């Protein structure tokens, strides 16, 4: 066994801004106190994945990304008592101390321990337990999942059903959770409302399932790219729309669409100016907005705060409002009950070593979500 | 006596711009149907009414302003039924008509008949019951209160308790329940919360008390002004700071002095940087920040979005998110109760006929609220 020992294994590194991920050999060092190493089955490409590379998303570099994911407990640090070596588990992007001030209030979740406020991608010590060519190589999000073997902190794992798929659940570690609470934890979305869904990428599938699981009655999906439509009617939208068919603006054609506004508006995208179309497109005396793209790292958008004076509500979350550790062990049983489905965002699985290619298939508009597997 | 007629009475009206009021003498038509003419008892000096002066608040000039007022009924057109002569009655600055998609609303209040949107500055026939100097008068609101006489729809009257004190009540048509239902009805403050207050006006103090009577166990009053602290203690606040103290900004003296942020924080001023410090000093997790002041017209604030991605909510609302019509009379009958004090906000009365000296008060800091006696 490996306990103990460093592992050499592959891992996708991310050297540099906007290039490949080059497929190395790394050392994983065994975990410290507190800290779990995890062997690696599936991982999801998120668009966020793409935002480190991009830049968009402004984290320490060289990285291992990669936080959607699903593997098995190898090893575990000193002092762990919440999974053993064996345990299915899914890293979480938001940790869950269940002791800071957000993981005692009852609805935040952005649990103070993060590094996501301001990545240091370093493990909660502040040191790495990966190194590349004798180099050490940052952690992303404190999961960095696009790599045979991670070690992670207790705080950001949790352990699920023995019997989940690893390949399916790894969407329940980001995409999906995300988009479905923000539908359903976040937004709140009333029976019989009226939703907008703007972006219809994997996490905004997930908002639609939501939104259709709360009850909403009219679900219009908005994206530019009028292959993801059948997609998006088949997990529940009714309607969609491409904003470049149309010669007047998309808020405003939404808001005629919907007699003066949606219910709930959702921004799944990341762009500046569809947050505060989402937002103006929903009804002016109550109308919800909730914010689930992330944008341009520090970039600012411009609005009239005479939106919000009428009535608007404007929200963001990250992970759909979820407690992490508390919810994920809930997820993924409620999907061994299929009381939602997964498969409708897997489009393309393809081994790890072709992760290049599934960021081409992302970045073309070709998949949804492409699971890489181990 | 007046029934049917024509009056000639006394009415502040501003005639452009940055110019003070002028008194003097117009025509007050008779009401057509589902009007209601109105004799003023009392009417306050809001903050939005100086707007309206200043150009920051854009609505069609020449106007009778005054939205905060109380009176008696003179009269009825045909077809009123819920007020008769000689009631006790506020005007409301939003309509409840009762019936659009709004009045339907569970939450919103914004009904879709007012003329706060695109100010129209008429009757919701299209017309003005003012003439002066011959010309004709726009209207403010649908109320135009500052004025010995004033025509307004029925769906902008509520009538109230015929034993309330309308030199304390007028306050209810806007002020205080503007403050107190940002607190309890949009924010929904919780006990035990801490609550920052920016802006201690009429409106910033009322919701302090709104905050108080939701059991917040920190109310934190901000304001440039230290003159008005003493009054903020007096109605709930437990500390107040000025900016001007201090070396570093304001949101981190707060986010320092409550640990990570506040609960709830309150814009009650109607500026585009307070608006965005007080959306800043909420916690990031589940923070909540209401917009109550009024901004400059057609002016965008410049915000980043990752401020709501961590978990705040941003709101703003209108006459403290209270369906007005329905509001009123039970706000009036709760301060009949002593449910609540209007005292404290009144620092001046004056006859009607010192308006711009009430205006001066208010726009040198002295004054908190105004009432104008008729
Ligand atoms: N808040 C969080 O906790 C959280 C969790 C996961 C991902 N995210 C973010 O959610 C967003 C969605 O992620 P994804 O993986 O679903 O992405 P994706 O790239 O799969 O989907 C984006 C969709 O937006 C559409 N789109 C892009 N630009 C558009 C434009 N100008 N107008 C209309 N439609 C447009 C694309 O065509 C695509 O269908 C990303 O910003 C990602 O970083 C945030
Ligand atoms: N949303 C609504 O329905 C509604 C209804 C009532 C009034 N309003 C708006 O609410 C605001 C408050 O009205 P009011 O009558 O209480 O006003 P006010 O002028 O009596 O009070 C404003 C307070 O803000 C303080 N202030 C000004 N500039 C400041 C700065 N840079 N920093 C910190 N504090 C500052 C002043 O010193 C004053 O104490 C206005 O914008 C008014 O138009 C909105």
Redesign the pocket.
């Known amino acids: 066994s490996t306990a103990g020992k460093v592992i050499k294994c592959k891992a996708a590194v991310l050297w540099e801004e906007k290039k490949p991920f080059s497929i190395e050999e790394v050392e994983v060092a065994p975990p410290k106190a507190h800290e779990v190493r995890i062997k690696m089955v599936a991982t999801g490409i998120?668009?966020?994945d793409?935002?480190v590379v991009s830049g968009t998303?402004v984290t320490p570099l060289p990285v291992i990304a990669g936080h959607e994911a699903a593997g098995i407990v190898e090893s575990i640090g000193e002092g762990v008592t919440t999974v053993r070596p064996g345990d299915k588990v899914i890293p979480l992007f938001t940790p869950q101390c269940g002791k800071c001030r957000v993981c005692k209030h009852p609805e935040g979740n952005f649990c103070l321990k993060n590094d996501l406020s301001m990545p240091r991608g370093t493990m909660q010590d502040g040191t790495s337990r990966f190194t590349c060519r004798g180099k050490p190589i940052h952690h992303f999000l404190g999961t960095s999942t696009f790599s045979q073997y991670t070690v992670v902190d207790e705080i950001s794992v949790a352990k699920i059903d023995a019997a989940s798929p690893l390949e399916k659940v790894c969407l329940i570690g980001?995409?999906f959770s995300?988009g479905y609470g923000?539908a359903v934890k976040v937004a709140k979305v009333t029976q019989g409302s009226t939703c907008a869904v703007?972006?219809?990428?994997?996490?905004?599938l997930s908002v639609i399932m939501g939104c259709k699981a709360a009850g909403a009655a009219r679900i219009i999906g908005?994206?530019?790219?009028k292959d993801?439509f059948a997609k998006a009617k088949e997990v529940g939208a009714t309607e969609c729309v491409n904003?470049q068919d149309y010669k007047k603006p998309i808020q405003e054609v939404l808001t005629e669409m919907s007699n003066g506004g949606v219910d709930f508006s959702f921004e799944?995208?990341?762009?500046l100016?569809?947050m505060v179309t989402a937002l103006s497109c929903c009804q002016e005396a109550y109308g919800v907005s909730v914010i689930?793209?992330?944008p341009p790292d520090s970039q600012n958008l411009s609005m009239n705060p005479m939106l919000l004076l009428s009535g608007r509500t404007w929200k963001?979350?990250?992970?759909?409002g979820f407690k992490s550790k508390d919810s994920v062990p809930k997820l993924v049983a409620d999907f061994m009950a299929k009381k939602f489905a997964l498969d409708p965002l897997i489009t393309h699985v393809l081994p790890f070593e072709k992760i290049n290619e599934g960021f081409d298939l992302?970045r073309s508009?070709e998949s949804?979500r492409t699971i890489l597997t181990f």
Chains 1, 2 share one sequence.
């Open positions: 998120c668009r966020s793409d935002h998303l980001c995409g995300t923000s703007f972006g219809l990428g994997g996490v905004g908005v994206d530019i790219n993801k904003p799944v995208i990341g762009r100016d569809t689930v793209g992330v963001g979350a990250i992970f759909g992302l508009g949804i």
